[PDB]
Design an enzyme around this catalytic site. Structure first.
Site, PDB file in Angstrom:
ATOM      1  N   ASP A   1       1.179   4.982   2.116  1.00 24.49           N
ATOM      2  CA  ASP A   1       0.797   5.676   3.339  1.00 24.49           C
ATOM      3  C   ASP A   1       1.142   7.159   3.207  1.00 24.49           C
ATOM      4  O   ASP A   1       2.293   7.500   2.903  1.00 24.49           O
ATOM      5  CB  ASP A   1       1.576   5.038   4.497  1.00 24.49           C
ATOM      6  CG  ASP A   1       1.329   3.542   4.593  1.00 24.49           C
ATOM      7  OD1 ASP A   1       0.211   3.157   4.984  1.00 24.49           O
ATOM      8  OD2 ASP A   1       2.248   2.751   4.271  1.00 24.49           O
TER       9      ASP A   1
ATOM     10  N   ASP B   1       0.843  -1.211   0.000  1.00 24.10           N
ATOM     11  CA  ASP B   1       0.000   0.000   0.000  1.00 24.10           C
ATOM     12  C   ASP B   1       0.872   1.253   0.000  1.00 24.10           C
ATOM     13  O   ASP B   1       2.097   1.156   0.021  1.00 24.10           O
ATOM     14  CB  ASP B   1      -0.973  -0.031   1.194  1.00 24.10           C
ATOM     15  CG  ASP B   1      -0.322   0.295   2.530  1.00 24.10           C
ATOM     16  OD1 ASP B   1       0.918   0.451   2.626  1.00 24.10           O
ATOM     17  OD2 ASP B   1      -1.079   0.438   3.524  1.00 24.10           O
TER      18      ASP B   1
ATOM     19  N   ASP C   1      -3.641   4.698   2.142  1.00 23.08           N
ATOM     20  CA  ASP C   1      -4.173   5.194   3.415  1.00 23.08           C
ATOM     21  C   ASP C   1      -3.818   6.666   3.524  1.00 23.08           C
ATOM     22  O   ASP C   1      -2.631   7.053   3.386  1.00 23.08           O
ATOM     23  CB  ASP C   1      -3.583   4.431   4.595  1.00 23.08           C
ATOM     24  CG  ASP C   1      -4.236   3.083   4.816  1.00 23.08           C
ATOM     25  OD1 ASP C   1      -5.258   2.774   4.172  1.00 23.08           O
ATOM     26  OD2 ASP C   1      -3.781   2.361   5.731  1.00 23.08           O
TER      27      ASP C   1
HETATM   28  N1  DCP Z   1      -0.200  -3.156  13.484  1.00 25.61           N
HETATM   29  C1  DCP Z   1       0.462  -2.081  12.989  1.00 25.61           C
HETATM   30  C2  DCP Z   1       0.168  -1.604  11.713  1.00 25.61           C
HETATM   31  C3  DCP Z   1       0.855  -0.501  11.212  1.00 25.61           C
HETATM   32  N2  DCP Z   1       1.800   0.110  11.961  1.00 25.61           N
HETATM   33  C4  DCP Z   1       2.552   1.282  11.478  1.00 25.61           C
HETATM   34  C5  DCP Z   1       3.969   0.874  11.081  1.00 25.61           C
HETATM   35  C6  DCP Z   1       3.911   0.791   9.567  1.00 25.61           C
HETATM   36  O1  DCP Z   1       5.142   1.078   8.899  1.00 25.61           O
HETATM   37  C7  DCP Z   1       2.886   1.861   9.242  1.00 25.61           C
HETATM   38  C8  DCP Z   1       2.179   1.653   7.923  1.00 25.61           C
HETATM   39  O2  DCP Z   1       1.566   0.364   7.912  1.00 25.61           O
HETATM   40  P1  DCP Z   1       1.707  -0.619   6.651  1.00 25.61           P
HETATM   41  O3  DCP Z   1       0.912  -1.851   6.992  1.00 25.61           O
HETATM   42  O4  DCP Z   1       1.433   0.170   5.390  1.00 25.61           O
HETATM   43  O5  DCP Z   1       3.265  -1.066   6.688  1.00 25.61           O
HETATM   44  P2  DCP Z   1       4.507  -0.610   5.735  1.00 25.61           P
HETATM   45  O6  DCP Z   1       4.151   0.516   4.819  1.00 25.61           O
HETATM   46  O7  DCP Z   1       5.646  -0.451   6.720  1.00 25.61           O
HETATM   47  O8  DCP Z   1       4.811  -1.952   4.892  1.00 25.61           O
HETATM   48  P3  DCP Z   1       4.278  -2.298   3.408  1.00 25.61           P
HETATM   49  O9  DCP Z   1       5.461  -2.079   2.512  1.00 25.61           O
HETATM   50  O10 DCP Z   1       3.945  -3.758   3.543  1.00 25.61           O
HETATM   51  O11 DCP Z   1       3.073  -1.425   3.133  1.00 25.61           O
HETATM   52  O12 DCP Z   1       1.952   1.879  10.322  1.00 25.61           O
HETATM   53  C9  DCP Z   1       2.081  -0.397  13.264  1.00 25.61           C
HETATM   54  O13 DCP Z   1       2.952   0.129  13.986  1.00 25.61           O
HETATM   55  N3  DCP Z   1       1.411  -1.472  13.738  1.00 25.61           N
HETATM   56 MG    MG Z   2       2.545   0.745   3.702  1.00 24.78          MG
END
Ligand code: DCP
Ligand code: MG
Length: 331
Positions: free
Chosen positions: A196, A194, A255
């Site tokens: 962010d 995704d 998001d």
């Molecule tokens: N249970 C969770 C979910 C999210 N986050 C925080 C850390 C993540 O970096 C951020 C964004 O969530 P994502 O699921 O989009 O994760 P990423 O962007 O880091 O990974 P991806 O490349 O899979 O989107 O929100 C968190 O601390 N705990």
């Molecule tokens: Mg993400």
């Protein structure tokens, strides 16, 4: 020696132990699927240690003097080194329970509890879900509708295009408002699940009502396939965008989060991750400094006070940690 907490050590984007860390993360994920949170964290921690090492682990002697490397994680690495394969990991990969839980939990709007319930009720495939639409939320229906595109890795080139349309809509809705890329892409990842974005304005309160205006602008341009707006704590919109591409288009999860500027540094820190990094940072804050950190603030429960931060660096400093830029938070 290497420090115990992931927030006390740099973890770069690329490392020398991807086979080993991948295998341990399969066991962590499988543990999460079974509600075994202790075991999930333990495997995640061990994988994170290997990501921080400067060299490949070629022999078992290299494990010496590493934290969070219990007997079980060690055996897994030992089997991989000696035999090229770990039987426990292969059994998990091949299991219908794991494959189905992975299938379901990947879908937009489906968590572990929902996926497990569906498994227990005899559902196995995406077609099984489509045959029971009454069992699905609208979010999950949208996730199934676009599931092929949503399981196609999001690319940096997609992110750049999306950031342009979000910035244009934000700038047209409210001059002075800012858009910041967060999540894994801020940490330097080349791909993701995704995109962010964190939205604010330098005058506190001027961010009120901004998100619905942004969303109207994006919807008018044909760019939105799905949108769920929620007031509750940050205002946010969980979306699926229709990203135009040469000759076609693809659905992409985005998001959008709005934070008032007073909370922006906390929101940026929380939303930048990694998930494990932030878990470790909050644990460090509570256990080592007696403070409660979240995406909104840093609270001293003894004094009943909130820390005023202008930046991420302020927060790290206040917790007695050397600053780590986002690209070293890949725990
Ligand atoms: N249970 C969770 C979910 C999210 N986050 C925080 C850390 C993540 O970096 C951020 C964004 O969530 P994502 O699921 O989009 O994760 P990423 O962007 O880091 O990974 P991806 O490349 O899979 O989107 O929100 C968190 O601390 N705990
Ligand atoms: Mg993400």
């Amino acid at each position: 020696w290497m420090p115990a907490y992931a927030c006390q050590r740099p973890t770069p984007l690329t490392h020398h132990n991807t086979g080993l860390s991948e295998a341990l993360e399969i066991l962590a994920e499988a543990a999460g699927f079974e509600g075994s949170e202790g075991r999930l964290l333990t495997f995640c921690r061990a994988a994170s240690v290997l990501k921080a090492l400067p060299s490949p682990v070629t022999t078992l002697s290299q494990l010496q003097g590493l934290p969070h490397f219990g007997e079980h994680s060690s055996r897994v690495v030992q089997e991989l080194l000696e035999h090229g394969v770990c039987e426990e990991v292969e059994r998990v990969r091949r299991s219908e329970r794991y494959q189905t839980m992975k299938l379901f939990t990947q879908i937009f709007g489906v968590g572990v509890k929902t996926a497990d319930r569906w498994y227990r009720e005899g559902l196995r495939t995406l077609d099984d879900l489509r045959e029971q639409p009454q069992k699905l939320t609208q979010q999950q229906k949208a996730g199934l509708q676009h599931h092929q595109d949503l399981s196609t890795p999001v690319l940096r080139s997609d992110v750049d295009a999306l950031q342009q349309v979000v910035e244009e809509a934000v700038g047209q809705a409210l001059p002075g408002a800012t858009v910041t890329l967060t999540g894994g892409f801020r940490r330097g990842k080349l791909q993701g699940h995704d995109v962010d974005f964190l939205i604010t304005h330098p005058k506190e309160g001027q961010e009120a009502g901004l998100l619905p205006r942004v969303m109207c602008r994006l919807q008018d341009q044909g760019l939105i396939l799905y949108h769920q707006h929620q007031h509750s704590a940050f205002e946010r919109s969980f979306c699926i965008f229709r990203l135009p591409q040469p000759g076609s288009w693809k659905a992409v999860r985005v998001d959008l989060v709005v934070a008032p500027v007073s909370q922006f540094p906390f929101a940026l820190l929380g939303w930048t991750g990694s998930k494990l990094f932030q878990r470790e940072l909050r644990r460090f804050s509570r256990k080592e400094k007696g403070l409660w950190l979240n995406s909104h603030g840093l609270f001293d429960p003894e004094q009943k006070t909130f820390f005023q931060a202008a930046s991420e660096e302020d927060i790290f400093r206040h917790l007695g940690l050397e600053y780590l830029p986002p690209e070293q938070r890949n725990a």
